[PDB]
Coordinates of N, CA, C and O and ligand atoms in Angstrom, one line a residue:
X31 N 322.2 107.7 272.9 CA 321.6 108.1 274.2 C 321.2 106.9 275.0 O 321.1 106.9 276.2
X32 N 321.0 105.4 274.1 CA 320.9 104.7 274.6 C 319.4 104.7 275.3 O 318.5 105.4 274.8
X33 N 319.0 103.5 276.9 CA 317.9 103.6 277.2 C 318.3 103.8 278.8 O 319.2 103.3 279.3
X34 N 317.5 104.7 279.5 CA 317.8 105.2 280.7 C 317.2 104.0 282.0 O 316.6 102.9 281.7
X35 N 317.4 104.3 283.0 CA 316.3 103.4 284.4 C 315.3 104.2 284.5 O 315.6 105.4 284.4
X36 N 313.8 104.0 284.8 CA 313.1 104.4 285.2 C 312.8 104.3 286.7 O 311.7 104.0 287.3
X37 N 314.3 104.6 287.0 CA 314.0 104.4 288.4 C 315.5 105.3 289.2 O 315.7 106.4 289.7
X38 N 316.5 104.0 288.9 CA 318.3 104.7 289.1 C 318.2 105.3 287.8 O 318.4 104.3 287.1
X39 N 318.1 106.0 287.3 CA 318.3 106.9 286.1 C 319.3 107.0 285.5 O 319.7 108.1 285.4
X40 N 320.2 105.8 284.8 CA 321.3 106.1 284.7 C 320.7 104.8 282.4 O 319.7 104.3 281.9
X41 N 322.2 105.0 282.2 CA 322.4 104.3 281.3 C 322.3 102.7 281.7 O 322.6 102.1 282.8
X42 N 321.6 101.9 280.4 CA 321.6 100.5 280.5 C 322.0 100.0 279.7 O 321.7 100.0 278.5
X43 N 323.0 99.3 280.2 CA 323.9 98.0 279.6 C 323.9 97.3 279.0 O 324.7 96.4 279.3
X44 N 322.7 96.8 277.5 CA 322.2 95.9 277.1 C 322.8 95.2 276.9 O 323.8 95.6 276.3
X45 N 322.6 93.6 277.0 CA 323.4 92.8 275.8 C 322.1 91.3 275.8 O 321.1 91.8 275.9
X46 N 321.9 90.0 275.6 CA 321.3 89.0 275.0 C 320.3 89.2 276.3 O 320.8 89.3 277.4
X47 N 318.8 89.2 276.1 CA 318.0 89.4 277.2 C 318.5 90.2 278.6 O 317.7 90.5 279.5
X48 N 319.5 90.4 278.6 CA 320.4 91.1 280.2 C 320.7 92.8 280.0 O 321.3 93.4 279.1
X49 N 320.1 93.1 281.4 CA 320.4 95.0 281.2 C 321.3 94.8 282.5 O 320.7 94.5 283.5
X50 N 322.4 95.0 282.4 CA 322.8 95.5 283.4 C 323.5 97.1 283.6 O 324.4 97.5 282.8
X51 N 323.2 98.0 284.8 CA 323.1 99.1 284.7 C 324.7 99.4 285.2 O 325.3 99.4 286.3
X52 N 324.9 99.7 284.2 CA 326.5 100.9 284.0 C 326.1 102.1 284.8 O 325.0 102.6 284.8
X53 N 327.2 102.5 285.3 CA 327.2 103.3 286.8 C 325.7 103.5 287.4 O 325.3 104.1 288.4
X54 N 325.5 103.2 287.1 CA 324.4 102.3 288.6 C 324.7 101.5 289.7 O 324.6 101.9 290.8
X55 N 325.4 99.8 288.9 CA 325.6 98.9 289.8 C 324.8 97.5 289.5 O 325.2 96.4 289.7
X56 N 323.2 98.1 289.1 CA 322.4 97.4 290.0 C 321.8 96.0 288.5 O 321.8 96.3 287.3
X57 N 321.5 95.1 288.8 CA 321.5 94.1 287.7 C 319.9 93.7 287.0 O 319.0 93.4 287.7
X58 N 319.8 93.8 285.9 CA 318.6 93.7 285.6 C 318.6 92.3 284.4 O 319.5 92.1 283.5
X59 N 317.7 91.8 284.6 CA 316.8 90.8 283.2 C 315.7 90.7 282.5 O 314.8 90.9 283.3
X60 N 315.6 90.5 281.8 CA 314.8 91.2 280.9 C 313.8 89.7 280.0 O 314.4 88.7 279.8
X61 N 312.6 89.7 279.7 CA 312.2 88.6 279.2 C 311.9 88.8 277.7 O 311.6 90.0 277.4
X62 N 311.9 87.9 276.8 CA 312.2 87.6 275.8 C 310.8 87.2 275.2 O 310.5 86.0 274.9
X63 N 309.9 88.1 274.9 CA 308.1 87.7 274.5 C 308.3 87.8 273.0 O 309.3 88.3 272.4
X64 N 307.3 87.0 272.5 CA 307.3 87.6 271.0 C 306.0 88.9 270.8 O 305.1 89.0 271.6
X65 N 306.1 89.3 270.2 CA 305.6 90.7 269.6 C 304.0 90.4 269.8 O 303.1 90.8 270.6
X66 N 303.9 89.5 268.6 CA 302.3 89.3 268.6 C 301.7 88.0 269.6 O 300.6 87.4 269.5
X67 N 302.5 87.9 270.5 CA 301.5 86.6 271.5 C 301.9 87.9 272.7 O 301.0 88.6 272.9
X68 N 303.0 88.2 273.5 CA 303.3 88.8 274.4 C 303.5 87.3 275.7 O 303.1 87.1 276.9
X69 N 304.3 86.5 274.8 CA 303.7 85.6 275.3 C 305.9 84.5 275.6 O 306.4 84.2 274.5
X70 N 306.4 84.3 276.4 CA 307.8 84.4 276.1 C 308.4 83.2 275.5 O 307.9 82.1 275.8
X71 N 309.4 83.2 274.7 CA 310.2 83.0 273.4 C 310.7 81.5 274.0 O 311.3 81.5 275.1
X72 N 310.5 80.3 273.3 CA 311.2 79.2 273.6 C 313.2 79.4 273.1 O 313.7 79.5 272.0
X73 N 313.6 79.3 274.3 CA 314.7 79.2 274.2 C 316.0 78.5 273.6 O 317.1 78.7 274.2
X74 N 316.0 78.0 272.5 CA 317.0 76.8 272.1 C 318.3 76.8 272.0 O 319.2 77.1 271.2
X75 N 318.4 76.1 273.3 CA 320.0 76.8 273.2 C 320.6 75.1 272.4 O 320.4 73.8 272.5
X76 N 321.5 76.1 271.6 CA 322.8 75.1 270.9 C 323.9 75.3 271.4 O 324.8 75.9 270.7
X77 N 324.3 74.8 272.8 CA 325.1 75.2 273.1 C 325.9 76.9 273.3 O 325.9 77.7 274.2
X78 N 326.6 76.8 271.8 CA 327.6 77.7 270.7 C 326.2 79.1 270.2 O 326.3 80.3 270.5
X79 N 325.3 78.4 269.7 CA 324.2 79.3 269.1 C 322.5 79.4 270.0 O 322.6 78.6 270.9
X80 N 321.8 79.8 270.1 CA 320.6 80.1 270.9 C 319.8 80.7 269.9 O 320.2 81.7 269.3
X81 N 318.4 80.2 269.5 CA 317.5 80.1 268.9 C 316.5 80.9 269.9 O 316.6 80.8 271.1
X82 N 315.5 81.9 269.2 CA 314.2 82.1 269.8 C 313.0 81.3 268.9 O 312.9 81.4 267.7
X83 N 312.4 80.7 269.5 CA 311.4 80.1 268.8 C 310.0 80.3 269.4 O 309.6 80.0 270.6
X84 N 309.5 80.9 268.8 CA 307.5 81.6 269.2 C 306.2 80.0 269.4 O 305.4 79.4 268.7
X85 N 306.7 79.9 270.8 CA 305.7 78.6 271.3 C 304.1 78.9 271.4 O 303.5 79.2 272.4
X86 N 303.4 78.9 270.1 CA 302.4 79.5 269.6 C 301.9 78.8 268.8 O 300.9 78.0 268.9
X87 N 303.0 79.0 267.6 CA 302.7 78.7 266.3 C 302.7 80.1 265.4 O 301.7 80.5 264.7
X88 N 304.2 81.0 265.5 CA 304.7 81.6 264.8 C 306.1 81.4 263.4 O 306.2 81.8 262.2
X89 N 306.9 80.5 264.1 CA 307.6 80.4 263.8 C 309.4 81.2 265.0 O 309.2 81.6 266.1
X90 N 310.3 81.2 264.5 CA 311.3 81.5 264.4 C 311.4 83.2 264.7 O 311.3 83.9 263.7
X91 N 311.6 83.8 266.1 CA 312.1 85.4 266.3 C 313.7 85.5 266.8 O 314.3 85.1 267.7
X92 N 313.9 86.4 265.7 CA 315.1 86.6 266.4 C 315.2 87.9 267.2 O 314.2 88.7 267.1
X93 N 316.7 88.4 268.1 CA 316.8 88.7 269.2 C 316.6 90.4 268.6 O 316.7 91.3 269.4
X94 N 316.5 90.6 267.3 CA 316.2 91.5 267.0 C 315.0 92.4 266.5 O 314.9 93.5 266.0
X95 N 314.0 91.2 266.7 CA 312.8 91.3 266.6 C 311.9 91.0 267.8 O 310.8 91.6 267.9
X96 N 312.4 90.1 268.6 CA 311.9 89.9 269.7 C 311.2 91.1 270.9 O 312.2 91.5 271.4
X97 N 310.4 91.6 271.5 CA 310.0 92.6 272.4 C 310.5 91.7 274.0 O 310.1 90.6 274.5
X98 N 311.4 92.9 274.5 CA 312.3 92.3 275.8 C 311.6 93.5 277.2 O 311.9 94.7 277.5
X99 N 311.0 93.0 277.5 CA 309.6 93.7 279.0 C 311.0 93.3 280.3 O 311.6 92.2 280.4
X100 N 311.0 94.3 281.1 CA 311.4 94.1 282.8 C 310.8 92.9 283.2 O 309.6 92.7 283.0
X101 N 311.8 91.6 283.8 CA 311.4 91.0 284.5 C 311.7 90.9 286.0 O 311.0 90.2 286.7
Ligands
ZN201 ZN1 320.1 102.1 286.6
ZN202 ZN1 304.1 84.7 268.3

């Protein structure tokens, strides 16, 4: 079923931080917080690979743990 718009009401297109809305049109991004700060994810990109890293003093989230809020 997927996750709807709470707005265009349609299906959302997820993929790495990015919703973009399938028959909609319309383009969404999304931020990348960690869970327990709410607070968003240092980025590390390697190029090839991309790291989330919790600028806190967590450690290491990945994209599957990470909480992704409308930005
Ligand atoms: Zn939509
Ligand atoms: Zn954290």
């Amino acid at each position: 079923m997927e996750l709807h718009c709470p707005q265009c009401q349609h299906v959302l297109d997820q993929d790495n931080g990015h919703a973009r809305c399938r028959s909609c049109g319309e383009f969404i991004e999304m931020k990348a917080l960690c869970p327990d700060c709410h607070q968003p994810l240092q980025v590390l990109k390697a190029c090839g690979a991309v790291d989330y890293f919790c600028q806190h003093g967590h450690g290491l989230i990945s994209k599957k743990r990470v909480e992704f809020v409308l930005a």
